[PDB]
Symmetry: D2
Subunit: 114 residues, 4 copies
């Protein structure tokens, strides 16, 4: 698992469950090509997005649908979504965990690269 | 200002000075159109991006060039930039302060919205 | 002010207003002595806690009563309070802005330190 | 494991390894009694701090020695330590994960209660 995402809910103190996200890879035409997607599990994690052979160097965008998450909970949110845009593997393949901590008017994102 | 951005550096405990950013507004054809741009001052703040008349309802994207900031300090950061996307003025004019706190492998963004 | 505190509410996207806090300074016998206290204004800021003369070198603790804040909004939060402990003025007088961002189960605190 | 701590380093994008912390329980005399301690593993986690029988309702303080962590890396930090003070189990025993994300002049802490 070269790429994993973990989402936490700072209002309820819980994993953020059933949060949809899409991963895009930057194309030579400067556009974002669909690459992977899924929704977080009961533990707030999304695994199996890609494989090491497929996960080559490049620029990736993870677009997390936070707005739908807050709407499902009946809470008015600020952001349309949370985006994490990064260059992968510029040192060669390692492992990437992207964590996002969500509040209605704030989010934090951190990468753990190991 | 109806729109102000403030950026802090969590490594040095200072305002993040001379950070470039670009604001876009989503057009009718779902394209991002350039709206405004600027750089943070010595206080880490960017004022005067827009006016109440020009800042109409819509979806806005603030793209903060955090990578160039970290690179100039000798640091290779994780993120290409920090992005903030939001619907503005949907229930009438508001004033928006977007705050960003920067670390090489992490950032947070908060909005303060006042009537 | 050599010491100012700013508190934001990440649930409502607003300054956190009327948040109480107490500042302590570590004494020679390693006890926390009361130093100053106050509440945030409508802008979420607390100014005038101390003066340059009184704010000597030492270890300081800012105890922000986040629990009473959340309770008054009908929310049962995780933390009893948010604490910030730091050595101040160790290399001469500085100005310290402590920023706190509050959610019911999370908080962050940053320091901006300027000469 | 009713109480677990996870620490991440936001400067290096890694688990914060060998971070010492002490857990205190509030005593009736208004003082903090030593309860548990340890240091984070290679994965930035500290497990086995307590057992469900021992982890009763009360006020707990986790004092994370962030200053020594930054000093070991040669980086000047702002905080003396990071403290997390909370009331446990006021709804009865659940599971507590305390996460802390560290920068030299900033820290964030979040609780995941499941
Ligand atoms: C630590 O909580 C945060 C607060 C904020 C908001 C910071 C702010 O509004 O500015 C306060 C610090 C400051 C520095 C220089 C001048 C004025 C205020 C942003 C991100 C955060 O994670
Ligand atoms: C508290 O500062 C943060 C930490 C993190 C990292 C959270 C994490 O790595 O997961 C902890 C949640 C968790 C861990 C193990 C078992 C259950 C829940 C993300 C954003 C933050 O602002």
């Amino acid at each position: 698992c070269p790429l994993m995402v973990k989402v936490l809910d700072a209002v309820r103190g819980s994993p953020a469950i059933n949060v949809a996200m899409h991963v895009f890879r930057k194309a030579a035409d400067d556009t974002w090509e669909p690459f992977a997607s899924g929704k977080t599990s009961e533990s707030g994690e999304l695994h199996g997005l890609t494989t090491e052979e497929e996960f080559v160097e490049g620029i990736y965008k993870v677009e997390i649908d936070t707005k739908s998450y807050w709407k499902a909970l009946g809470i008015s949110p600020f952001h349309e979504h949370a985006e994490v845009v990064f260059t992968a593997n510029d040192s060669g393949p390692r492992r990437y965990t992207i964590a996002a901590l969500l509040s209605p008017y704030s989010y934090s994102t951190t990468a753990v690269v190991t």
